[PDB]
Each structure stands twice: as C-alpha cells, then as structure tokens.
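Cont'd.
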Amino acid sequence: FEHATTVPNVPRIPYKALVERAGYAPLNLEITVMSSELIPSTNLEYVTCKYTTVVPSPKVKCCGTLECSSARHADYNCKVFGGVYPENSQMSEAYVEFSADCAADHAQAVKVHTAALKAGLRIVYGNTTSMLDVYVNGVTPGTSKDLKVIAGPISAAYTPFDHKVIIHKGKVYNYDFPEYGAMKPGAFGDIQATSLTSNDLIANTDIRLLKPSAKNVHVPYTQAASGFEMWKNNSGRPLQETAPFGCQIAVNPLRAVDCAYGNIPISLDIPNAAFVRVSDAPLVTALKCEVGECVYSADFGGIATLQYSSDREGQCSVHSHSSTATLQESTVHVLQKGGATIHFSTASPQANFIVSLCGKKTTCNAECKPPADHIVNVPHKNDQEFQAAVSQTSWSWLFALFGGASSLLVIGVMIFACSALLT
Amino acid sequence: FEHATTVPNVPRIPYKALVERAGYAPLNLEITVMSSELIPSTNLEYVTCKYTTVVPSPKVKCCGTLECSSARHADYNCKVFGGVYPENSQMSEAYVEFSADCAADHAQAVKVHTAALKAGLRIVYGNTTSMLDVYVNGVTPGTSKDLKVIAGPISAAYTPFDHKVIIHKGKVYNYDFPEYGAMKPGAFGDIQATSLTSNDLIANTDIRLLKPSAKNVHVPYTQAASGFEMWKNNSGRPLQETAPFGCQIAVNPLRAVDCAYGNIPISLDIPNAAFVRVSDAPLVTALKCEVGECVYSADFGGIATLQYSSDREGQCSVHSHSSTATLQESTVHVLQKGGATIHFSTASPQANFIVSLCGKKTTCNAECKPPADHIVNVPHKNDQEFQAAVSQTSWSWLFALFGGASSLLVIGVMIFACSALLT
C-alpha cells in the first residue's frame, strides 16, 4: 500500500503517522531518522609540507673556470662565483625538497563540488521494526525485508563546506588556497606536489646565494621561512567547532555527520499482509479529556487524562490529527472503560488538539503556566504558530479595546447616514 | 618589460604584435597557440556490463520439505516447488553476475564537473623562439628560459560536455544514466558496481523461476533481456563526431582537445637584454605605399611596395596598426633606399591600413577585387565589420541618395521662415 508523508530532518526525534486502507483498521507508523551523513564530491589539487634544503658539496677548480646548468629538481639557484679560497672558482648549488617525513604531517588542498545525502531510517509499523538506509534522492528505492521506501529530495540544499578546503592531520579548514603552480613565498603552499609518491615538485622559497668568504670551505645562502609552519601558527579553529547546523565532520572520505535542517518527503510501500480488517478491530465511543498541570515549554509539561468506552480488549491506534501537539507511544492498551493518560509538549499558553483513538474525534483545552527553571538540556519537539502563541485573555483585552475604538466611529457614520436620509 | 594583448583562440594561426618602450626600437612578436586541451574534473559512479545468470545445481529431498535463506549475491531468487518428479520437492535458486570479460568491455558512468584550461604557446620575440605551456587562469605563471607569461581567463566559458556522460571503449556519449541503485530492467545500467574488482553488484533483471515439469531434472527461468546489449544497438554517434566547436575528444583522462572559441588575454614580461636602442636601428623617413593586386580574403591576396629612405642597413619591424589587414613575416632587411614588398590579408573591399616600417607611420589605399575561387582549406585570418566592408562608391550613392531626400526639407522650412518673416 502506497503512502507518503514528510519526516522532519532532526535526528532521533520520532514521527507519528496513521496508515489506513479503506476496508481496514488504521495502524501506527513511527518513523525515525537515526543517522544522516552527507558526502561531498572531492578531488585533491596538491599536498603541502615543510621543505628541507639539500645543499650538496660544492665544485671548486683551483685554476680553471666552471659553469653549470638546470636539471630536474625544485628551486635551483646555481651560481659560479669567481676568485675565492687561496684564482680558484666555486660553483655553489642548492635546492629544496620534501621534508624528512611527510607521511604523517602533510596538508591536502581539496576542492568540494556537490553533496550526497545518505540517511539512516528506522521504521516501526504494526508490530514490526525495521533497520534500513536510503540515499535521499527522488528515485533510489530503499528496501527492507518486505517493504520499499523512496525518499524525495531535501526541501533546501545546505552545506557546511566552502568551495575549497584543507585537510590537516585530522582537521578541516575552509581556506582559499592558491591555485596550482601559482604560489607566493612565505604564504601557504610553497612546495606543491600532486601526491606524496609523485614527483614534479614546484617551489618558491626565494633561496638567494651569497659569496663565500672564510678560511674554510662552506656555502652561504638565505631563505624565507616556511609558509606551512606559519600557517600552522596562524590557523584558526577547525570546522569541527564552527560548523553551522550542529553537525560533525569526520574524514576518512570527508563526510558531514548528523546535520539538522529541512525535511525529507518520504514515500513508502506498506506490505499488504501487515494490516487487519475492520471485522477484528473493536469500536470506540465517548471520548472526553481532562487537563492537569500543563506547565509549558520544557519537555513534557502537560498531563491529561482520557475518558473512553470501547467494546473489546485489543489494540488501537491513538493519534493526533492537528499539528500543535504530538502525543506519545500511539497504541494504548485500552479497557472497556478507563482513564488513560497523555503527556502534552506545548510551548504556548493554549491547547486545541484533536485525538482519534480508533475512528472517533475529540478536543482538548487548557491554559498553560510559565515554568520556573531557566536552563535545560533537552531539545524541543514542536514549532510555534501565529494565532496560537498569545493568551486568550489578552486576545479579549485587545479585541475589546480595538473594537471600542471602532464602535463609536461606526455609530457616528450611521448617525450621519440616518440624519441625511431623514432630512 | 610588461606587455599585454588578447590572442584569439584559434590553433596554428599566428598573431602579430609590436612591443616598444621610450628609448628603444620597436620589436616583433609572434605568439601562436599550438595545442590547447581542456580537462574537466570527473568522478565515476558505476561500471556496467552484460551479465551471466549463474544457475547452480538444485537441491531435492525425496520425502521431506525444504526452505532456503538469502545470501550475499546479486538479484537472487529462490523458490521451493512442491510435489514433483514421481511428495519430492526441489529448491531452485538463481542469481546473476558480471560476464566472463569486463576489463575489456564495460561502460564507465563518469560524472563531469567544471574544467581546467591548458595550452601550448609558441612565443617568438626578437630572434628567439620559446616553447612553453601555460595554465589559462590569471594567477599561474609559465616561464621559458628567461621570460614569464601569465594567461588571463577565457572571455566566455564553454564545454562540449554535459553533466553526465558514458565512456565506452574509446568513445564519449552524452547521455543521462540513472542514479546509483536506481535502475529498471531492460535498460541501461541494470548491473552496477563501484569498480570492476570490487564487490556490491546491484541488479534488477526480473529473473523469475518456473515450476519444473519433465522426466528429467532441470530448472526453468525467464528473464528480461540485457539492457546494455540493448543499448549498444541504439548507441548514437560519439562526441568525436558531434562536438560543438570542432574539438576532438580523446580519453585517457577525458580531455577535449583543440577547441576554437573566445580569446586569451595574454600578459608577458619581455627580458630586458633582448631590446635595441634608438641609436642602433636605422632611422626611416619618406614612406610610400603603392598597393598592388588586392584579391582579398583568401590568405595573402595582397602585394604592396614600400618606398622608403633610411640611413643604416639592418632589420626593421613592420606592422599593420588597424584591424582590417594583417601582414606577413613582420621583419624587413632594409637598404639605404629600397623597394621592399609586403603581403596584406584583408577581408573587405578596401585596403585602408597603416604600416610602420621602423616607427614612421604611413597609410595604404586600394580597391580590393573579389577572389576567383569558392572554397579554400585555410580558415579566415580577419573578420567582417559593418562600416568597413562597404565600398566607397556605394557610400557615395547612399550619401547622395539620402542627402537628396533631406536637404529639400531644409529648403521647405526655409521657405516657411521666409514667408513668415516677410509676409
């Protein structure tokens, strides 16, 4: 049987629903989203470390002269200084390379295009629970042992990620790194390389060579500082601690785990064998509702009692049809006459919610009192609605005042109409 | 020395320029794009083939009954048919897998994000020709032995490719494959895998079993046909043969070789030692231009004559300033008085351009006769312009024809002014 609802995308908050086929008793539907990783589409441009400057032993002719040419390394500066060390000649050479150990400490400069949308659903229906997952696109079917779910696209696209990103030892940084082979000395990305194994380094360290002047042989040079270490000093906070929806970030493949945004339109194919016809369900009359405390806004400040009358013992499917209150556990063990209890969860001083136990209908009414506790650790479960968050006594005061400011005006214009038509 | 122009993106058609500065003689510049491929960032989802349906030997109990549980396989069907082969029962089961040979023949459902922009320039300056290869974006410098070149981004972005694509044996087909695990039987992408050697074959081929009835043991099954072999019957033409700008496509990394669109703003640093002062080039006065043939638009249908008067004997740098003619060879060995000859390449009925021999600028004037051949292998070296492709005779006809229909209005309103101010 085909049925389609809209799960809200907040992890581990259950969603209640009724599925009914015309000719069958209704049945419960508790759907929860227990994990939601979303995976962007990545590729790596280059891989950065600190340098080590290989300076080989120099070449000196005591009498003749020397020249040297470019070869396959990183930044060269090979100069061929003249008369030195008593005319001799020295040809100094120096070139950077990767550090002694990049296999642990190296940054990756990764680019992020678009995201996938994995999920983690539990579905409880009738007396059967089900563990499954689904790619949230409009077409891919998620199959349980018997049923099939498709999970249409998110109402709004959202990313914690910028277009560029850096992966360090474990941490994820939004930082507009320079493009390939287009680098400045001292900034991030002096040494670039397509992988740790691959060759063809590029470099910009401004390694300048100087004239040697000493009794013993050396080779003098100078260099700007490493840009990667300067960046490690100046790096702010990672995305584990700045992310914009309470999500987490974890990278072996760089996923963002357990966001909280938007809502998932669902569509579900309930198996035909998991129902019951109306010839086996009981019949329910005479629901009324008493309201207890209702100290609102916290978690479960409301307490209400139901009064009912059935024809058998069995199971029913208690369910709210309105959207302000979402009741709890959804299949109450009724008796022939009873007094079962609910827990409201409101966040406004009113109550107008409709209960259907196995086919009936009723209402509730209350006035909710503000709590005396200022700070609490538990998440909300409902949303505020206008024309539901202002107390009815204040509605009466504003209506009386705002209508008294109009009644005299309408009386005046009726006086002018009557006095004109009388002449 | 900094110098910046805009090279039109057409391979193997040279482009002329003069660069100069105060105190030096102008020098030649020929920059010809040789080999310009563009590479888009890709990632593959899944790897499709044909298939073989593994149908193993069945199981039969002579008296008792049988059940079978599922297993980690592909599209897997087991059924447990009852009384048969004179209450014996059989447990038929079958599934599919990749064919005998998919490393040879398989599609790759590559998804294609945006694109990089390599190029292959020839740069000729003075008496030195350099062969480099620049990344076209405004940051990445490309160095020869001595000069440095950056290539600004393309004036207008363009791709032959689409968002999804399918790579067969050597070919590229723009096609919209279904998502991962979102397939229908008898069409493309029945049997998917993230790579060849990996596991997770996902299949919906509608294999269904039948009740056996014979005098020998067998196992009957029906199945919809292979969608991949259905696809190769209906595969159209690859993008080698349908690309939108004459770009070839060859795929080990899926590059789109040799487009022709837009123009590359180049910027360049000429090495300072390859200049020449104003006290070594010959000073040139008294230029004449006797333009000859002008059979325009093909390649080089012009022949002009320079009649000059110089002092020394050396090389001079010849160049057309206006944008309706581009000359050839860009250098002329002068004499003290000579008659050196150029070739124009105009695409208009008028040769109205300015040649400068070594600084002194002179004009050219001719009528250009239409070419006596319809179709020529070499593409155009100039473009058309309104108000420049219209010969002066027709300008005289149109100006006289409009002035005859506009001056008499002035005559009539002066008749109004006369008859009103005299009365």
